[model samples]
Target: DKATIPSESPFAAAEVADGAIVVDIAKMKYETPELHVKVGDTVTWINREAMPHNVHFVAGVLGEAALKGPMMKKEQAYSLTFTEAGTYDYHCTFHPFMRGKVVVE
Candidate 1:
């Protein structure tokens, strides 16, 4: 379908960082669309726009390490460290098209 990013996006905003890997939420898209980090690396997600945004990992696929996140306002953030080796694909609960993944090794 469309390139996924919401066109008329409210360009919104995470639930924190290390030398952390940072992902952005803006223009209604998970800015990186994909990311790769080590098992112990901390990935921080930040909202840059003015509306609410959040993270939601697929329950059946990724387990419950982080199934859902709070609705974050602009400048807000969320961070999770990949503790195990696996792939984590996720989308925002509110904006399903806003999808992305983190591959951990």
Candidate 2:
């Protein structure tokens, strides 16, 4: 039960396995609402919905700090390598309700 998935809803964060540290965009929500990783670990987000999805950081964006994700389709994925140690919250711009947070140690 290390996944530590959230909620009792029908479509909870039941799409992950092992130590991938990946999150899926499904059921119009982020599979795992919260995630934890080291400063060097990379967090990956995969879109499972038919519609386009993206990840946008609350702290905004830039070059290497490219916190803006592309409009991703089903099976499309994006990954971010955290260089700084801090908490970063993200959400899908197309669907604000789809949110998740990453804590880098």
- Cα lDDT of model 1 by residue, 1-105, tens digit: 101121122222222324547898999999998798876776778888887888888656545444676777788777666677778788988898889988888
What lDDT does model 1 reach?
0.70
User: Model-by-model lDDT, in order?
Assistant: 0.70, 0.67
Pick out the ten consecutive residues of candidate 2 with the lowest summed lDDT: 1-10
The C-alpha TM-scores of every prediction are 0.77, 0.72
Clashing pairs in 1: 11-27, 13-47, 14-76, 14-77, 14-78, 15-77, 15-78, 16-78
Candidate whose TM-score is highest: 1
Clashing pairs in 2: none
lDDT of 1 at 72: 73
